[PDB]
Design an enzyme around this catalytic site. Structure first.
Site, mmCIF file in Angstrom:
data_model
loop_
_atom_site.group_PDB
_atom_site.id
_atom_site.type_symbol
_atom_site.label_atom_id
_atom_site.label_comp_id
_atom_site.label_asym_id
_atom_site.label_seq_id
_atom_site.Cartn_x
_atom_site.Cartn_y
_atom_site.Cartn_z
ATOM 1 N N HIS A 41 -54.737 -27.706 -2.132
ATOM 2 C CA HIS A 41 -53.898 -28.250 -3.203
ATOM 3 C C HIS A 41 -54.403 -29.595 -3.745
ATOM 4 O O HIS A 41 -53.806 -30.122 -4.687
ATOM 5 C CB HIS A 41 -52.427 -28.355 -2.747
ATOM 6 C CG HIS A 41 -52.148 -29.454 -1.763
ATOM 7 N ND1 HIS A 41 -52.239 -30.792 -2.086
ATOM 8 C CD2 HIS A 41 -51.730 -29.410 -0.475
ATOM 9 C CE1 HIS A 41 -51.920 -31.523 -1.032
ATOM 10 N NE2 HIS A 41 -51.602 -30.709 -0.043
ATOM 11 N N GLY A 143 -49.778 -39.087 1.200
ATOM 12 C CA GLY A 143 -51.171 -39.392 1.423
ATOM 13 C C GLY A 143 -51.713 -38.923 2.753
ATOM 14 O O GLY A 143 -52.919 -39.035 2.982
ATOM 15 N N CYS A 145 -51.907 -35.860 3.741
ATOM 16 C CA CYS A 145 -52.384 -34.481 3.673
ATOM 17 C C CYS A 145 -53.831 -34.397 4.155
ATOM 18 O O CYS A 145 -54.656 -35.262 3.855
ATOM 19 C CB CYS A 145 -52.255 -33.944 2.247
ATOM 20 S SG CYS A 145 -50.565 -33.493 1.794
HETATM 21 C C1 LIG Z 1 -49.536 -34.984 1.570
HETATM 22 N N1 LIG Z 1 -50.045 -35.701 0.587
HETATM 23 C C2 LIG Z 1 -48.076 -34.995 1.813
HETATM 24 N N2 LIG Z 1 -47.667 -35.524 2.987
HETATM 25 C C3 LIG Z 1 -46.356 -35.558 3.285
HETATM 26 C C4 LIG Z 1 -45.366 -35.089 2.443
HETATM 27 C C5 LIG Z 1 -45.748 -34.545 1.222
HETATM 28 C C6 LIG Z 1 -47.105 -34.483 0.877
HETATM 29 B B1 LIG Z 1 -47.560 -33.855 -0.494
HETATM 30 O O1 LIG Z 1 -48.059 -32.587 -0.466
HETATM 31 O O2 LIG Z 1 -47.987 -34.668 -1.495
#
Ligand SMILES: *C(=N)c1ncccc1B(O)O
Ligand SMILES: *C(=N)c1ncccc1B(O)O
Lengths: 306, 306
Positions: A41, A143, A145
């Site tokens: 994504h 952030g 992810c």
């Molecule tokens: C990753 N960027 C992420 N981490 C925690 C909660 C939500 C998300 B998201 O997919 O932007």
């Protein structure tokens, strides 16, 4: 002695974290050999995250659309492709600090260490369980992810989890490292929700055995029960069944305490019905289900890694 | 979101652990620059650990009496001396992976990460608090002596704790890295015991603020109280006093929640008196005192290290 929530040392993984930038979105990636893995994504815009066709959105991208940075060193992206739900970016540099590793998929009921991560910089480390409903109760902000979960077998890193999103109840969903989700979740913004969870019975029994080894015996008792009658009570307290294999696995912890496995189930039967009555167990007022038998044998005896 | 017990990534410390052998006793040591630090009781026999004169026992030792091994690499000991309660072994090799570091001493009420260790091999990592009575509730088995505790400020490792022993109640005592004990404890086998402890009030308030930020609001309430009347209640529940400086420090967490600091004390007043009534807070049935305000602002906002 003592008993605490304990992760594997994170240094072997710390050497593999990078940050991946595509468009306006910045996330973390895992750099092994000449490949960086990250959630697919990352190629999505805000309005792409609704109904995306990732095959369509990826052929519209280039090698240079992807910026990779390993600390203060920039990596040249020389190839890209999608494997299920992750992106797999060939770079021109084999990570000089690639450990021995495997990609394994874990069961619900097993545990792992997480290295939470932001802009390719590790921020913290903590232990987790895979919940019966395939979620994890983590600590992740925007952030994070691409942060990974892992187990360490002497010198070998078994990567098991890549973070992808946070669900409504504040729990998290992700994939294994081959990009296949843990549970019925998808990387496109819908009304997806966790689903009903259970308490991991075999782990609770392993933790009660840790408390005997460390000196909390107030919940022990003389009585016994059958595997079948104990399952009648766990059914009614939303605890999953216990099998003869769970019994056979608790064997070593039974022989160190001299508390037959079925005797400890009678203990657990009374804790479930009578409560804990203002006392605690291993500094907790709750029946703790996020340690496996192996975790107990790890801390309450001794195993190290290299 | 989410909230969990979280350590700093341990890789910077993992590169400094070694094992020290003297006589029949094997423990862990900390290798920075050309010096290995370790508990001075490594030079002691079993019957030395009763009434030792360490000045006397050290002049009876040589450079070669000490064996140091950094993984599969052996270090030549070229000098040795005692600084308070630690031994400080000059080796002929400056640790090629020496991080930026400081030796700081922490206050009771502050937290730190531990890297538990056996034969110079890191086994696990976990977060700890320094208890008001200068003990730590750790997880340490035989052979973990010399394992260190540390905090990480962006790229700098503040070493704060070296493990020395386990006391009767299963808690642990140690020194700072200049060899001075935390609390009234000594490295010679006596009947020493922990002493009475208190709950760290300022930390509990910081954790309640973490639970509001993560969505647990059931314990909030309309009322308020004075700093003075709240201390009357904390006195009677063995909670330490709260100061205007603790209030000023909670300021940022008050302004993110819109819950005035004294309003949260009235919440804490009722939790102490009425209990929690079968509910939980951040998956705990207990008022948790091992997170500082800084820890909360760390996880509930975002800071990473390098
Ligand atoms: C990753 N960027 C992420 N981490 C925690 C909660 C939500 C998300 B998201 O997919 O932007
Ligand atoms: C260190 N070797 C140690 N760790 C835990 C408990 C007791 C001891 B001891 O000093 O041998």
């Amino acid at each position: 002695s003592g008993f605490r929530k304990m992760a594997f040392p994170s240094g072997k993984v710390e050497g593999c974290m990078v940050q991946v930038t595509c468009g306006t979105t910045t996330l973390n990636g895992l750099w092994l050999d000449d490949v960086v893995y990250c959630p697919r994504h990352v190629i999505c815009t805000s309005e792409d995250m609704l109904n995306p066709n990732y095959e369509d959105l990826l052929i519209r991208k280039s090698n240079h659309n992807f910026l990779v940075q390993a600390g203060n060193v920039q990596l040249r992206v020389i190839g890209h492709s999608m494997q299920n739900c992750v992106l797999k970016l060939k770079v021109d540099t084999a990570n000089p600090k690639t450990p021995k590793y495997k990609f394994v998929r874990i069961q619900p009921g097993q545990t792992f260490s997480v290295l939470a991560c932001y802009n390719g910089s590790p921020s913290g480390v903590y232990q987790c369980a895979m919940r019966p409903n395939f979620t994890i109760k983590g600590s992740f902000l925007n952030g994070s992810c691409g942060s990974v979960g892992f187990n360490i077998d002497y010198d070998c890193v078994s990567f098991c989890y890549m973070h992808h999103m946070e669900l409504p109840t504040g729990v998290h969903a992700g994939t294994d490292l081959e990009g296949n989700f843990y549970g019925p979740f998808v990387d496109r913004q819908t009304a997806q929700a966790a689903g009903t969870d259970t308490t991991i019975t075999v782990n609770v029994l392993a933790w009660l055995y840790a408390a005997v080894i460390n000196g909390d015996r107030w919940f022990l008792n003389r009585f016994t029960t059958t595997l079948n009658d104990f399952n009648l009570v766990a059914m009614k307290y939303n605890y999953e069944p216990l099998t003869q294999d769970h019994v056979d696995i608790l064997g070593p912890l039974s022989a160190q305490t001299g508390i037959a496995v079925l005797d400890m189930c009678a203990s657990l039967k009374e804790l479930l019905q009578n409560g804990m009555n203002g006392r605690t167990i291993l500094g907790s007022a709750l029946l703790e289900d996020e340690f496996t038998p192996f975790d107990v044998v790890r801390q309450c005896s001794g195993v190290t890694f290299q």
